[PDB]
Amino acid sequence: FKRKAASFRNWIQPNGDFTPEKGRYHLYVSYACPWATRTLIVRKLKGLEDFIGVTVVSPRMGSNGWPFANVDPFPAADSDPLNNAQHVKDLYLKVKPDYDGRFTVPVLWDKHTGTIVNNESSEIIRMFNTAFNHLLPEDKAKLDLYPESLRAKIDEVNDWVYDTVNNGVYKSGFASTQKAYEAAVIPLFESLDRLEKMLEGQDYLIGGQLTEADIRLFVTIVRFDPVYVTHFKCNLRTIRDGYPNLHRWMRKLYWGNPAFKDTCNFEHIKTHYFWSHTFINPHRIVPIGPIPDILPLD
Amino acid sequence: ELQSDISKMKTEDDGSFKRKAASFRNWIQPNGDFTPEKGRYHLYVSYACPWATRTLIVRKLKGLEDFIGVTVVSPRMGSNGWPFANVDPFPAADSDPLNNAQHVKDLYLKVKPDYDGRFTVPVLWDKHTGTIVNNESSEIIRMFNTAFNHLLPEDKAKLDLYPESLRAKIDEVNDWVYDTVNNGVYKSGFASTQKAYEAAVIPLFESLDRLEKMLEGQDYLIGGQLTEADIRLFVTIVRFDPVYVTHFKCNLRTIRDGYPNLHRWMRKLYWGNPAFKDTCNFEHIKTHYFWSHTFINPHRIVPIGPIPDILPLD
Numbered sequence: 001f002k003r004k005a006a007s008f009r010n011w012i013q014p015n016g017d018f019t020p021e022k023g024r025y026h027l028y029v030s031y032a033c034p035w036a037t038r039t040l041i042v043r044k045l046k047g048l049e050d051f052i053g054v055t056v057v058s059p060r061m062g063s064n065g066w067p068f069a070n071v072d073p074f075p076a077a078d079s080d081p082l083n084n085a086q087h088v089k090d091l092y093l094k095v096k097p098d099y100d101g102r103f104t105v106p107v108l109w110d111k112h113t114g115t116i117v118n119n120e121s122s123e124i125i126r127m128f129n130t131a132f133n134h135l136l137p138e139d140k141a142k143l144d145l146y147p148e149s150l151r152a153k154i155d156e157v158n159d160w161v162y163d164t165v166n167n168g169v170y171k172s173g174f175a176s177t178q179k180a181y182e183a184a185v186i187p188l189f190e191s192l193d194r195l196e197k198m199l200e201g202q203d204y205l206i207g208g209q210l211t212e213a214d215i216r217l218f219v220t221i222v223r224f225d226p227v228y229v230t231h232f233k234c235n236l237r238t239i240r241d242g243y244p245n246l247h248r249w250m251r252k253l254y255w256g257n258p259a260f261k262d263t264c265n266f267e268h269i270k271t272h273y274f275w276s277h278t279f280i281n282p283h284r285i286v287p288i289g290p291i292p293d294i295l296p297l298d
Numbered sequence: 299e300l301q302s303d304i305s306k307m308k309t310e311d312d313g314s315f316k317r318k319a320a321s322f323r324n325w326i327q328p329n330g331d332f333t334p335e336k337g338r339y340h341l342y343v344s345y346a347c348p349w350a351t352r353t354l355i356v357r358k359l360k361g362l363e364d365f366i367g368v369t370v371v372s373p374r375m376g377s378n379g380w381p382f383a384n385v386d387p388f389p390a391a392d393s394d395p396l397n398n399a400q401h402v403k404d405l406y407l408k409v410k411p412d413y414d415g416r417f418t419v420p421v422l423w424d425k426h427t428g429t430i431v432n433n434e435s436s437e438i439i440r441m442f443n444t445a446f447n448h449l450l451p452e453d454k455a456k457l458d459l460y461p462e463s464l465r466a467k468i469d470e471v472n473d474w475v476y477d478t479v480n481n482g483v484y485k486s487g488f489a490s491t492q493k494a495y496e497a498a499v500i501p502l503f504e505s506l507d508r509l510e511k512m513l514e515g516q517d518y519l520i521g522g523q524l525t526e527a528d529i530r531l532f533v534t535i536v537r538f539d540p541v542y543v544t545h546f547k548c549n550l551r552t553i554r555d556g557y558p559n560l561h562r563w564m565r566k567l568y569w570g571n572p573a574f575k576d577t578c579n580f581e582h583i584k585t586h587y588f589w590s591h592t593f594i595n596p597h598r599i600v601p602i603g604p605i606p607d608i609l610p611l612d
């Protein structure tokens with residue numbers, strides 16, 4: 001498996017086409033997508049709700065891609081209030097009728113220019129971290145998920161976490177031969193062993209504080225036991241019974257911070273993967289287990 | 299032959315899986331068509347198959363290894379059903395030493411060319427008449443338990459996996475263990491609608507809870523001794539973490555992490571009794587299920603986990 005890179009790459013900035021203003025931007029997401037979920041977590045952590053709206057698609061990705069709730073009603077899914085789109089593809093096609101890539105989420109939309117600002121989760125969360133600091137209340141303005149002295153270590157972990165873990169699980173799950181499957185899953189678990197020892201005495205990956213590296217990791221790890229273990233055959237061992245440090249870390253984040261918990265919808269997560277990926281799971285059946293979705297704090 | 303052959307099959311339209319009964323149901327009796335003799339009967343099995351594994355376990359427990367030969371098929375059960383090793387080489391798999399069969403189906407079609415059922419292992423074969431005696435694991439293990447007793451050494455002859463005082467309980471336990479556990483995992487795994495899956499997987503785990511309680515303080519399901527109830531249970535449990543959890547979506551919890559008594563009970567049998575360990579081939583087990591059931595697993599990928607296949611004793 002090879003991930004086709006994102007094609008809308010503009011930034012929100014004081015001095016550009018896309019300036020930081022209240023009620024100008026809008027974020028289209030699925031609760032199921034860990035990429036999109038990065039942007040939801042950071043959006044809450046930075047208290048950006050008044051500047052940035054959110055529309056949640058249905059988790060059931062049929063042949064037309066991600067549907068809006070008026071096409072496919074599902075608990076906690078929304079209709080598109082802006083462009084009245086039926087599927088995420090309409091957003092893309094409206095602004096670029098010749099667009100040749102995947103119709104992905106997250107989509108960061110500009111309500112003023114009627115265009116897509118950025119559809120790359122790593123950039124959305126980066127801009128979310130600073131671009132609105134001047135308009136936000138104190139504590140929210142001060143929060144820095146990418147602080148200067150840690151940017152080197154963050155960039156480092158981000159790159160290999162992205163490669164072997166965030167994308168690793170999908171490389172494992174989408175591989176169509178035994179050899180490609182094994183070539184992906186072994187590094188995945190090697191990297192987990194590494195993260196596991198990194199967290200031996202810590203509550204955060206890097207620097208004793210919350211960073212965007214924890215956010216990027218969390219979205220994968222929280223989906224691991226409920227989905228990746230079975231759905232993507234990433235099953236050498238599990239988080240809850242295989243990785244005490246990762247398990248503690250993930251649970252602290254989940255239970256202790258509404259930004260990680262309120263943006264985490266397990267029904268959307270399990271429905272999306274199991275029901276949509278018929279090339280892996282032909283009858284679209286959603287396993288009941290494991291129970292529970294996530295364990296309480298120790 | 300493909301329709302009753304290639305496991306790319308059909309369920310009931312409500313989604314549920316309805317197992318067809320085995321149709322070769324004869325017994326080894328003192329003067330029947332099939333009398334007990336050393337060197338007359340042969341057993342065709344896969345190591346993957348829990349039903350067939352029942353017969354392999356009892357065969358060792360009862361000291362029947364010198365009496366009844368065994369031929370192990372390849373676990374890769376393709377469009378022609380189970381193959382012999384000359385058709386599909388696989389470590390520890392055999393070619394047919396008796397009838398030059400390509401696939402297990404050739405055994406069935408030789409004796410009944412109009413056979414319409416499934417070509418299942420185990421097959422208990424009679425070398426003298428060249429027919430199938432019995433293809434029901436539950437009956438094979440019964441007859442193995444008693445029918446050769448007059449021919450065995452005292453230690454083997456005296457072993458009784460179905461003793462008089464425990465029979466009614468064995469039968470009761472066997473009945474709902476078969477329905478909700480042994481065949482329960484298959485009902486869960488093979489279900490083709492969400493509803494049918496849930497109707498099977500929930501009672502499965504209710505029965506494990508029940509089994510977990512029975513095994514509190516106990517080393518055996520019944521009567522404080524090894525019986526056929528353990529053997530019948532063990533073949534499902536030992537396959538649970540390595541296969542059923544992911545392949546059959548029996549993942550509410552695992553044995554190693556969710557059921558301490560079952561976990562203990564299984565490791566003891568496996569580690570403490572060579573009949574259970576020497577008949578357990580995990581490579582065959584995982585390859586068979588994952589590679590064969592393309593209607594569940596289209597790319598035939600066999601997961602590396604969980605590691606290990608079975609944990610050491612404490």
Ligand SMILES: N[C@@H](CCC(=O)N[C@@H](CS)C(=O)NCC(=O)O)C(=O)O
Pocket residue numbers: 302303305319320347348349350379416417418419420433434435436
């Ligand atoms: N009632 C039989 C069931 C045996 C059985 O269905 N074995 C399976 C292996 S899981 C088999 O040979 N399947 C071949 C097929 O169904 O095509 C018994 O207990 O012996």
